[PDB]
Every structure is written in C-alpha cells, then in structure tokens.
Design a protein around this ligand. Structure first.
Ligand code: FES
Ligand SMILES: [Cl-]
Ligand code: NA
Length: 107
C-alpha cells in the first residue's frame, strides 16, 4: 500500500452544508465521495434505505451548488431539474447546500 492517505480523500474537498431538521452541519466531501457517505462518516444520521439510487429515502434538495447523480434512477427529469437529489448516489461538483429529509416533498 502507501505511506499516506489517498490524496483524493485529503485534498480538494467540497464544502457541503447539510441543512438538516436539527440545524445546518457543514462537512467536507471529497469529489469522489457520495454526499450520504461523507455525512455518515462524519457521524451524521441521514436517512437512507437502498443505497442504490432506486428509492426516495435519502432524498434532499439542492439549495445551492451542483451535484453529479448520474447513478440515480428514482427521480424523474423534472424532479432533478427542480433540485431534488438522491444523496446516496450524488457526488458534489461544487460547494453546496443540501436540505436533507426531503422524501415527503416528492410528488
Ligand atoms: S437510499 Fe434509496 S435512493 Fe438513496
Ligand atoms: Cl433512515
Ligand atoms: Na478517487
């Protein structure tokens, strides 16, 4: 192996502000890391079920910034156009603010 952590995990991280029901919590999220994975590693308890982009459990809404959720399946094109994000399969592509716990907002 290597005598250092992976550069991709130490450097170049995006700021992700999770606007949760219990307040805003800003974490660093590597570009190669799904938002849910960074949040759960940081000790947050965000909702999820399938971890595969096929449900609404981990849904959030992008309040600021952009994501890459090319692996997602469940959201329709309009929902994604309107800012919904499946946090379990979404990489940040900018500093961003994601309101969590938005499953119920989906129609
Ligand atoms: S937990 Fe099912 S889509 Fe994210
Ligand atoms: Cl949950
Ligand atoms: Na990587």
């Amino acid at each position: 192996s290597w005598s250092h952590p992976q550069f991709e995990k130490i450097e170049g991280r995006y700021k992700v502000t999770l606007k949760t029901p219990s307040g805003d919590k800003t974490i660093e999220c590597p570009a190669d890391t799904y938002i849910l994975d960074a949040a759960e590693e940081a000790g947050l308890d965000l909702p999820y079920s399938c971890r595969g982009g096929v449900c609404s459990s981990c849904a959030g809404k992008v309040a600021a910034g952009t994501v890459d959720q090319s692996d997602q399946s469940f959201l329709d094109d309009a929902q994604m156009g309107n800012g919904f994000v499946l946090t379990c399969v979404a990489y940040p592509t900018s500093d961003c603010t994601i309101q969590t716990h938005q499953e119920e907002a989906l129609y």
